[PDB]
Amino acid sequence: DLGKKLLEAARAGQDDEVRILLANGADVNTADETGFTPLHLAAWEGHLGIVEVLLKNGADVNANDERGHTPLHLAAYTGHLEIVEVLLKNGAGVNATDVIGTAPLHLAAMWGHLEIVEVLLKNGALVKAKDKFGKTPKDLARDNGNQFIYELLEKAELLEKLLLEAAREGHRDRVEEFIKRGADVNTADETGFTPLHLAAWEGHLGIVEVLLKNGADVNANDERGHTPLHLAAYTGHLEIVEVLLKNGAGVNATDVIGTAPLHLAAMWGHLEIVEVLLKHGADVNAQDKFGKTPFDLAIDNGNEDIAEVLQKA
């Protein structure tokens, strides 16, 4: 009984009635049929006073409704700047995501709330956070014509963009420069390729050594599960395969299809890479979607020379 009253006194904005109910023992973390709590409703309707009293009585600042929305999601959706700052001040998760990977920044940027975008960024909101549909806040702001927000997130991405371009084009002095200026060495592009993915793909050995030297993730996956070692075994750059394994590259890393670096080394006839992978404990028993082992793939592509090595094991 008290639960329902508190929930509707928050929705309705009745400050005095919320005080009375909480003093009579009403549960501050009460939840309705879909998981909305009093703090959810006060944030949606924009009742700053109530928000502050509920948190003051031990209200869960990161409660999740049935869909995964938190009070911060709702404040950023409706554009209530003052309430956003209160929620973060009380320990609200700035990078919380609902069931389709939506963060507060996605919503602020989509509904065109410049000030909230800025406050969310100031508290560590991920600039390139991708939702369930591959969309960042910058994408959502572009598609909705929120010009100022687009230009702000584009600026907030530029440094990480130039590192990715530098690593792809093979410009070592630019890679070094942008790392020295705070570039996130593990940033990702539109498909999950990190600078290390792109240097291995293009065969830029020098830059692969520099990236690992500055704490690049050697076993990073893109959106399809490919690690850097995967790409180096496909393209057939032996020296990059050697550098990755020296830094703990998962030799038996499997992508979304189960394919491992040894599958591609045999499929595209790269004898030298096969040896090094087996030296580091590459399992030949592993299969994949098609159910084929690295030995089967060596015969299909007319490469019996590599197949004879696998037989011996």
Numbering used by the authors: 13 to 325
Share the article's original sentences.
In this paper, we present a strategy to fuse specific, high-affinity protein binders to obtain multivalent or multispecific scaffolds of predetermined geometry. DARPins are used as building blocks to confer the desired specificity to the construct. A series of rigid connector modules replacing the DARPin capping repeats allow to combine the individual DARPin domains in such a way that their distance and angle can be altered to test different geometries, bringing the binding partners of the DARPins into a defined spatial arrangement. The two helices are not just joined end-to-end, but instead the two domains are made to overlap in such a way that the joining helix is stabilized by contacts with the domain cores along its entire length.
In the context of DARPin-β-lactamase fusions, we observed that the paratope of this DARPin has a high propensity to form major crystal contacts, leading to crystal formation under a wide variety of conditions. Indeed, constructs D12_Hxx_D12 with H02, H09, H11, H13 and H15 yielded diffraction-quality crystals in space groups P212121, P6122, P212121, C2 and P1, respectively, at resolutions ranging from 1.8 Å to 3.5 Å. Only three of the D12 constructs did not rely on paratope-paratope interactions, but instead relied on paratope-capping repeat or paratope-connector module interactions as dominant crystal contacts: D12_H11_D12, D12_H13_D12 and D12_H12_D12_H12_D12 (P21). The propensity of DARPin D12 to engage in crystal contacts is so large that, where the crystal geometry does not allow for its preferred interaction, alternative interaction geometries are observed. These are found as paratope-paratope interactions, interactions with the DARPin N- and C-caps, with connector modules or with the target protein of a second DARPin in the construct.
